[PDB]
């Protein structure tokens, strides 16, 4: 009564250790962290699939071992095997659930990074659109117009960087991501500033041309 027990002891311990790791409530707070946890979770899956076969052998053998036995040792071993089946199923579900949550966390972190980039682009656009300098001379007049044209060119260049988080955000919300509240709010503010900047830039274009 050694090889079987050792393996049971071993698997149960591995199970206990893996359930704990998966039971973690640690939520990513950065995109690199989010990628880290995903990697670790992926590794845990490999360990789980790697233990499946041995789990089955222990399960099936456990039944034969206790079968027909009446000594306390076997009755206790029998209860222990019930635990194993439970913990094994519990682990599977815990993993799936944990995997599900980290994916959402990766999605939100990515969005957060892109959303912050768009906010910066937008703040800068707002700064430029905030004040127009009256030409002190012909040289200044040419410079103003030209500088603004390049500005308009950059608005067009960053267009994708601004709209990107809007599309990724809405999609996250559409998938029912757990951060939806924060995401909805940030997506709206971006959309609104993007809309206002464009309108304000169109008016400015006219101003610089007719004055």
Curated annotation (Swiss-Prot):
Spectrin repeat start and end residues: 1-103, 108-195
Protein location: Cytoplasm, Cytoskeleton; Cytoplasm, Cell cortex
Entry's family note: Belongs to the spectrin family.
Quaternary structure and interacting proteins, as annotated: Composed of nonhomologous chains, alpha and beta, which aggregate to form dimers, tetramers, and higher polymers. Interacts with BCAM.
Job of this protein: Spectrin is the major constituent of the cytoskeletal network underlying the erythrocyte plasma membrane. It associates with band 4.1 and actin to form the cytoskeletal superstructure of the erythrocyte plasma membrane.
Disorder named in the UniProt entry: Elliptocytosis 3: A Rhesus-unlinked form of hereditary elliptocytosis, a genetically heterogeneous hematologic disorder characterized by variable hemolytic anemia and elliptical or oval red cell shape. Inheritance can be autosomal dominant or autosomal recessive. Spherocytosis 2: An autosomal dominant form of hereditary spherocytosis, a group of hematologic disorders characterized by numerous abnormally shaped erythrocytes which are generally spheroidal. Clinical manifestations include chronic hemolytic anemia, jaundice, and splenomegaly, with variable severity.
Name of the protein this chain belongs to: Spectrin beta chain, erythrocytic
Source taxonomy: Eukaryota, Metazoa, Chordata, Craniata, Vertebrata
């Amino acid at each position: 009564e050694q090889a079987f027990l050792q393996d049971l002891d071993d698997f149960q311990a591995w199970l206990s250790i893996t359930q704990k790791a998966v039971a973690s409530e640690d939520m990513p707070e950065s995109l690199p962290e989010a990628e880290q946890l995903l990697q670790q979770h992926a590794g845990i899956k490999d360990e789980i699939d790697g233990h499946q076969d041995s789990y089955q052998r222990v399960k099936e053998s456990g039944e034969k071992v206790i079968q027909g036995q009446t000594d306390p040792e076997y009755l206790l071993l029998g209860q222990r095997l019930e635990g194993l089946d439970t913990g094994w199923d519990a682990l599977g579900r815990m993993w799936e659930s944990r995997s599900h949550t980290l994916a959402q966390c990766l999605g939100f972190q990515e969005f957060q990074k892109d959303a912050k980039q768009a906010e910066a682009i937008l703040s800068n656009q707002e700064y430029t659109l905030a004040h127009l300098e009256p030409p002190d001379s012909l040289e200044a007049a040419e410079a103003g117009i030209r500088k603004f044209e390049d500005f308009l060119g950059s608005m067009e260049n960053n267009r994708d960087k601004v709209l990107s988080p809007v599309d990724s955000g809405n999609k996250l919300v559409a998938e029912g991501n757990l951060y939806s509240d924060k995401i909805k709010e940030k997506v709206q503010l971006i959309e609104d500033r993007h809309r206002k900047n464009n309108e304000k830039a169109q008016e400015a274009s006219v101003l610089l041309r007719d004055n």
